[PDB]
Amino acid sequence: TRAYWHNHRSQLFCLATYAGLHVLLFGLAASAHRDLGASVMVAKGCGQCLNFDCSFIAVLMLRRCLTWLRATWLAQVLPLDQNIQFHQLMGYVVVGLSLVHTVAHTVNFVLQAQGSASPTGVALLLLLLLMFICSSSCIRRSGHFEVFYWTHLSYLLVWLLLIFHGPNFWKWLLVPGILFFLEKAIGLAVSRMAAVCIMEVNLLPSKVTHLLIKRPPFFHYRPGDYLYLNIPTIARYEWHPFTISSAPEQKDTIWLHIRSQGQWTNRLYESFKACNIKCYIDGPYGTPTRRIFASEHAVLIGAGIGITPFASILQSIMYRHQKRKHTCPSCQHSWIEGVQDNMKLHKVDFIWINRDQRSFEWFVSLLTKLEMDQAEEAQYGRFLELHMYMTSATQPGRPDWSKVFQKVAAEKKGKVQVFFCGSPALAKVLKGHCEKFGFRFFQENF
Amino acid sequence: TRAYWHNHRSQLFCLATYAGLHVLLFGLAASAHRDLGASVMVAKGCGQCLNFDCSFIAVLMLRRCLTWLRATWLAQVLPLDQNIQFHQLMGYVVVGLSLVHTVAHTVNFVLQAQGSASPTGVALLLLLLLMFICSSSCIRRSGHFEVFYWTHLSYLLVWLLLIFHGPNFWKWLLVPGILFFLEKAIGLAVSRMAAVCIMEVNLLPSKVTHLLIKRPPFFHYRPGDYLYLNIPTIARYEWHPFTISSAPEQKDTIWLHIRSQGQWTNRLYESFKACNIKCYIDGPYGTPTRRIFASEHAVLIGAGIGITPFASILQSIMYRHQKRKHTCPSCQHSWIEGVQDNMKLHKVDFIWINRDQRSFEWFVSLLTKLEMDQAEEAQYGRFLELHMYMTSATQPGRPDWSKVFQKVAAEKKGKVQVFFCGSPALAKVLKGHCEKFGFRFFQENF
Ligand SMILES: Cc1cc2nc3c(=O)[nH]c(=O)nc-3n(C[C@H](O)[C@H](O)[C@H](O)COP(=O)(O)OP(=O)(O)OC[C@H]3O[C@@H](n4cnc5c(N)ncnc54)[C@H](O)[C@@H]3O)c2cc1C
Ligand SMILES: Cc1cc2nc3c(=O)[nH]c(=O)nc-3n(C[C@H](O)[C@H](O)[C@H](O)COP(=O)(O)OP(=O)(O)OC[C@H]3O[C@@H](n4cnc5c(N)ncnc54)[C@H](O)[C@@H]3O)c2cc1C
Numbered sequence A, B: 001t002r003a004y005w006h007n008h009r010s011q012l013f014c015l016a017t018y019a020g021l022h023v024l025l026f027g028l029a030a031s032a033h034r035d036l037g038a039s040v041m042v043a044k045g046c047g048q049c050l051n052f053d054c055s056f057i058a059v060l061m062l063r064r065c066l067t068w069l070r071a072t073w074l075a076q077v078l079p080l081d082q083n084i085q086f087h088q089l090m091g092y093v094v095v096g097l098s099l100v101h102t103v104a105h106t107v108n109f110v111l112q113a114q115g116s117a118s119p120t121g122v123a124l125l126l127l128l129l130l131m132f133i134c135s136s137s138c139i140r141r142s143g144h145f146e147v148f149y150w151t152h153l154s155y156l157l158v159w160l161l162l163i164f165h166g167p168n169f170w171k172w173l174l175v176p177g178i179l180f181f182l183e184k185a186i187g188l189a190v191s192r193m194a195a196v197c198i199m200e201v202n203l204l205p206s207k208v209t210h211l212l213i214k215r216p217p218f219f220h221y222r223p224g225d226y227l228y229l230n231i232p233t234i235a236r237y238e239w240h241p242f243t244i245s246s247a248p249e250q251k252d253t254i255w256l257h258i259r260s261q262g263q264w265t266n267r268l269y270e271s272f273k274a275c276n277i278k279c280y281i282d283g284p285y286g287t288p289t290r291r292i293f294a295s296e297h298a299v300l301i302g303a304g305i306g307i308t309p310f311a312s313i314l315q316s317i318m319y320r321h322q323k324r325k326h327t328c329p330s331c332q333h334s335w336i337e338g339v340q341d342n343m344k345l346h347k348v349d350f351i352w353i354n355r356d357q358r359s360f361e362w363f364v365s366l367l368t369k370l371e372m373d374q375a376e377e378a379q380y381g382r383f384l385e386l387h388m389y390m391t392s393a394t395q396p397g398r399p400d401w402s403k404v405f406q407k408v409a410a411e412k413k414g415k416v417q418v419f420f421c422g423s424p425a426l427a428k429v430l431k432g433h434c435e436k437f438g439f440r441f442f443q444e445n446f
């Protein structure tokens, strides 16, 4: 009852700020035009609201500033993965407000009847109706990913008509417009792009495609970083982000596990289900993860489906762990040296809570790989523990965090340092169960 | 004749752009006021010039954007270490222009005689004369580092008076003013600062102080990064940058070799010459240096005095090299393993050209340390070669780059990859002598 409200404590606050700014502008422009009777008042209010929307709807779509903002506490508080579907909501309110604006001014013109404004307004109305119609989900559900882009590129014409349609619109558009164009000028053909080539595409079960793309000769990424994959064979101008699910110590390839959860990522699987093709990835982005390897007995916890970076992190952890098992050639002596300058872990736990393994079968097979690779060493010491709960049937059902944390605190391998990747409700439950045992809780953005 | 002009090909271009913008504004405001006779014309021209200067003189002093700009090709083209002494030049031209402005308007008032403008102008003139007098070099040459800061903080009053003195000045000040205040609001008490404490201060010969400051528990820097040291015992509000001269693999301390080349860095040596005191360093900044360790037979070259980061780079190189000499406990077998995931070098050359070893005696002793540490291994293989030329008397005299590069190309340890740290004249000579041998030349910013 309060956990559901706790997850959306930020989306609700952003929507409340939005509706509050709209009611503020509406009432403000309805007070300053009270003498005009009920038809220019509504129309001028909606005019101010349009001035705001048609201008900031573009500062939402800054996928160059979103990457930098998505690494910080600013991302910890307000959601930035919802920017596409907050932008769609700003588009829907632009359409509704412009409709009531047109209707208000039409009724006003009729009352006055009992060349910039009206003709440029008919032009704006036709353009916004075209963007509305040719920006629905049916345009991209069918394999028309280039009709959407072109017929939705008319926001330039919308802004152009809107400059010499609204007298004071340019003042609004100046800041978000210049920011949008400066970001479009920062990112060009080979700004950060790298024309990589798929070495192979496996089709894992339950509609998830595994892309082994060539690693560009100089590509350095921390474990847990993502990249904006682009495949002109699926969609020419779409750049979708995906977490790299391979440890950086893997020098030959870059893995990407792409789950069929949309209309592009689904088009990928549908096209390869019916390889060396073109791709243009865009850089590694992500939060620094040195807090995990410069730790002791890290307890990684992951809920839901945002645990693709935990695959990369666990693979890197086990790579660095196996990289400190030395064997002498002469006398075959096999010793283990100390924690050395990259990883300081003596133990690692990985607790994965989920509803099921619907799309995460590759994840379970990868964890099985790691557990079996290090399990033949488990007679003297265990380094990676894997708990995988399912909550819908591996120990079925939710954890009992009191018991789990008490067992973690039973054996002492150092200063336990919990890390979390999930919902803020479970984050509250975790910090509550965690401050009792003195574990240094964390929560990663990814 | 053309090398001297080649070094200053960017300072001369910046000064030419500056003088051109001034002559543009002067002539533009002298054309639009041609009817007013010779006294309001000059005064309004100088007014426009002041509007530009008094506004952008502050965008020069953005030591928060300068760190980000100093890592890129944008820093490769235009100089950013001259921002302090370009700012001083903007201050001198502000004073000269305001003097001729005052004189022009005084002669105009006299011609008209044969309450904002004039009184606020007397106030601006007195404030600018105070900043001019109490911002000379004599204020900080004596140990008055706090009189300078306070009596030079009156640029706030100068801007305040200038808003309601010039009608259109606020339009100019809006962008640099908001940028300056946003940068001052980004950096607060503990934004990136770390209240470190000096563990020790050695006084090396020839007026250079070696600060072994405690390494804050979580401080990660690449080899070759700098930090903005601050010592409230020398100067309370001054933040001078210094390159860290210790390899990151040194976990206990952070070294800083501070040469007495000014009035603060000199005050440091003079005060300690006549330890646990307060310091507040500000983060690691610098260009990525992975190109040196992910290389083969890197030929580092350093000219002049900007080779403090080469001390850190060489110490890190030799640390990582000695970190791959394994010895088995049982049979005492001592083997060397392969290039492993951090450093790929099989050889390193370090060619240091300078005029003399005036302040760089610590550097020569450090290179002697490294050469002697690895020289007892030189019977089977040499990893670090050290050439140190002096050009004023170690092989005295300039190198013969044809011979040096031919000797480098004689022995084949991989794909030679020259790196350079020096003047653009020597950079031209190097790229010329380097494209002949197919060495992949580089030039670092630091
Ligand atoms: C850092 C990061 C890493 C991700 N890694 C993966 C991964 O490895 N595998 C995976 O299957 N999914 C991953 N996603 C989520 C998502 O499935 C993909 O990022 C991709 O954007 C989906 O595109 P789509 O066309 O299939 O979605 P659509 O069908 O276009 O839309 C469906 C959903 O995807 C969202 N969406 C649409 N376009 C984008 C976009 N450009 N960026 C982000 N969200 C978008 C919509 O808001 C909606 O919620 C990741 C998301 C982020 C932020
Ligand atoms: C990245 C970097 C690393 C440096 N590392 C070292 C180092 O390890 N040892 C060393 O002796 N010097 C170093 N310097 C140069 C310089 O000596 C110091 O940075 C310091 O700023 C000098 O201050 P000062 O008060 O002695 O100079 P001043 O007496 O105030 O001025 C003399 C000269 O220093 C310049 N200067 C003044 N204040 C600054 C400032 N805040 N930042 C930069 N330049 C300034 C002036 O333009 C002038 O050319 C470095 C410079 C940079 C950019």
Ligand SMILES: NC(=O)C1=CN([C@@H]2O[C@H](COP(=O)(O)OP(=O)(O)OC[C@H]3O[C@@H](n4cnc5c(N)ncnc54)[C@H](OP(=O)(O)O)[C@@H]3O)[C@@H](O)[C@H]2O)C=CC1
Pocket: A007, A008, A009, A010, A011, A077, A078, A079, A303, A304, A305, A353, A354, A355, A390, A391, A392, A398, A399, A422, A423, A424, A425, A426, A429
């Ligand atoms: N900034 C934001 O606003 C963010 C929002 N989210 C939220 O993520 C949610 C995703 O849905 P979902 O992933 O189901 O939410 P959860 O993250 O709560 O579900 C994740 C897993 O946690 C399990 N779980 C829930 N409560 C407990 C508990 N008390 N003890 C142990 N395990 C528990 C669930 O099992 P069961 O489902 O069986 O209870 C589920 O398998 C969205 O509602 C979204 O709002 C995600 C990231 C940040």
Ligand SMILES: NC(=O)C1=CN([C@@H]2O[C@H](COP(=O)(O)OP(=O)(O)OC[C@H]3O[C@@H](n4cnc5c(N)ncnc54)[C@H](OP(=O)(O)O)[C@@H]3O)[C@@H](O)[C@H]2O)C=CC1
Pocket: B007, B008, B009, B010, B011, B077, B078, B079, B303, B304, B305, B353, B354, B355, B390, B391, B392, B398, B399, B422, B423, B424, B425, B426, B429
């Ligand atoms: N962005 C910019 O504008 C930058 C400017 N600089 C320039 O750095 C200069 C510093 O003075 P300085 O350091 O003396 O200039 P140099 O860097 O040219 O002097 C560095 C060393 O190189 C040696 N040297 C010069 N020419 C040759 C050559 N042809 N072959 C071999 N060795 C050579 C010099 O020896 P000798 O002195 O005995 O000839 C000197 O010891 C300043 O003039 C400044 O303009 C520095 C960085 C960037």
Ligand code: HEB
Pocket: A044, A046, A047, A048, A050, A051, A054, A098, A099, A101, A102, A105, A106, A117, A118, A121, A122, A123, A124, A125, A128, A162, A165, A166, A167, A168, A169
């Ligand atoms: C984009 C969306 C849109 C649309 C569709 C529209 C449509 C329209 N419209 Fe508009 N508008 C607008 C947006 C718009 N619009 C704006 C923004 C403005 C401004 C406001 C103010 O007031 O400010 C206007 C404004 C306006 C005005 C006022 C004038 C000026 O400029 O000042 C008028 C009259 C109008 C009309 C109109 C009409 C008739 C129409 C239909 C045809 N308009």
Ligand code: HEB
Pocket: A054, A057, A058, A061, A084, A087, A088, A090, A091, A092, A094, A095, A131, A132, A133, A135, A136, A155, A158, A159, A238, A239
């Ligand atoms: C005028 C204004 C505007 C408007 C109204 C709109 C409206 C809209 N919209 Fe928009 N968009 C925009 C402007 C806009 N828009 C922009 C600017 C962008 C960006 C593009 C790029 O980035 O290039 C977008 C983008 C976008 C996107 C992205 C693409 C991808 O996928 O990646 C999407 C999905 C959208 C949707 C939408 C919708 C649904 C709507 C409703 C109709 N859009």
Ligand code: HEB
Pocket: B044, B046, B047, B048, B050, B051, B054, B098, B099, B101, B102, B105, B106, B117, B118, B121, B122, B123, B124, B125, B128, B162, B165, B166, B167, B168, B169
């Ligand atoms: C800061 C430096 C400075 C200074 C010192 C000055 C000083 C002066 N001044 Fe000055 N101004 C100025 C800066 C200045 N200034 C400016 C910036 C301006 C504006 C320009 C225009 O025209 O725009 C002026 C402006 C001005 C004017 C015009 C008016 C208006 O506002 O419009 C006048 C009359 C004056 C006067 C004067 C005088 C009498 C003096 C002495 C006492 N002037």
Ligand code: HEB
Pocket: B054, B057, B058, B061, B084, B087, B088, B090, B091, B092, B094, B095, B131, B132, B133, B135, B136, B155, B158, B159, B238, B239
């Ligand atoms: C009004 C305007 C102005 C003016 C006129 C000036 C003028 C001047 N200036 Fe200044 N500055 C300034 C504004 C200014 N300024 C600023 C804003 C700054 C910054 C500060 C801080 O950062 O805090 C400076 C800063 C500054 C500095 C830095 C400090 C250190 O050391 O670190 C110096 C050195 C200077 C000098 C100068 C001179 C010499 C002059 C001539 C008088 N300058």
Ligand SMILES: CCCCCCCCCCCC
Pocket: A010, A011, A014, A015, A059, A060, A066, A078, A079, A080, A082, A083, A085, A086, A089
């Ligand atoms: C449908 C709910 C959408 C909620 C959007 C939250 C605010 C996103 C801000 C993104 C800023 C770039």
Ligand SMILES: CCCCCCCCCCCC
Pocket: B010, B011, B014, B015, B059, B060, B066, B078, B079, B080, B082, B083, B085, B086, B089
């Ligand atoms: C005395 C010569 C000064 C030359 C200044 C060059 C331009 C510096 C630009 C700094 C921009 C932040």
Ligand SMILES: CCCCCCCCCC
Pocket: A015, A018, A019, A022, A023, A049, A093
């Ligand atoms: C300006 C009017 C804003 C209305 C916002 C409504 C949001 C509904 C989210 C479901």
Ligand SMILES: CCCCCCCCCC
Pocket: B015, B018, B019, B022, B023, B049, B093
């Ligand atoms: C606006 C007048 C600018 C004059 C610049 C002079 C620069 C001299 C550098 C030595």
Ligand SMILES: [Zn+2]
Pocket: A328, A329, A330, A331, A332, A333, B328, B329, B330, B331, B332, B333
């Ligand atoms: Zn042995």
